[PDB]
Structure 1
Amino acid sequence: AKWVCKICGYIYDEDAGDPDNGISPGTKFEELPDDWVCPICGAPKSEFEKLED
């Protein structure tokens, strides 16, 4: 699934993960650590919104 950072537009794609910041491809958004943040703007997980209806 993909989740967008409502502040900057960054897209956390679960299939891509976030390797540079310790997240391997395939990591679900809910499993990301509670203090993981958007690699672009630094927003907390609370500011992301899943891209699903």
Structure 2
Amino acid sequence: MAKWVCKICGYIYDEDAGDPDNGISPGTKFEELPDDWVCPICGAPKSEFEKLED
């Protein structure tokens, strides 16, 4: 699946890994993350992520 980078801290949201420590199962698309999910490292909102693709 796709990977997204936090433009603040460099955390990679890997859709294949999800974010289970914060309620997100592996395989959850970025678009499907709750609106108020934040970067688990720096706390940045979803707005600050960019998808890693051309």
Q: TM-score normalised to the size of structure 1? A: 1.00
Q: Structure 1 CA distance, aligned partners of 2:39 and 2:26?
A: 15
Q: Specify which structure has the higher proportion of helix.
A: 2
User: SS at 1:20's partner residue?
Assistant: helix
User: SS at 2:31's partner residue?
Assistant: coil
Unaligned runs of 5+ in 2: none
Deviation at 1:27, TM superposition (A): 0.2
TM-superposition CA deviations, 1:22-41 (whole Å, max 9, x none): 00000000000000000000
- Aligned Cα RMSD in Å? 0.1
Runs of 4 or more above 4 Å deviation: none
Unaligned runs of 5+ in 1: none
User: SS at 2:4's partner residue?
Assistant: strand
Q: Structure 2 CA distance, aligned partners of 1:32 and 1:14?
A: 10
Identity %: 100
Deviation at 1:8, TM superposition (A): 0.1
Q: TM-score normalised to the size of structure 2? A: 0.98
Q: Structure 2 CA distance, aligned partners of 1:37 and 1:2?
A: 15
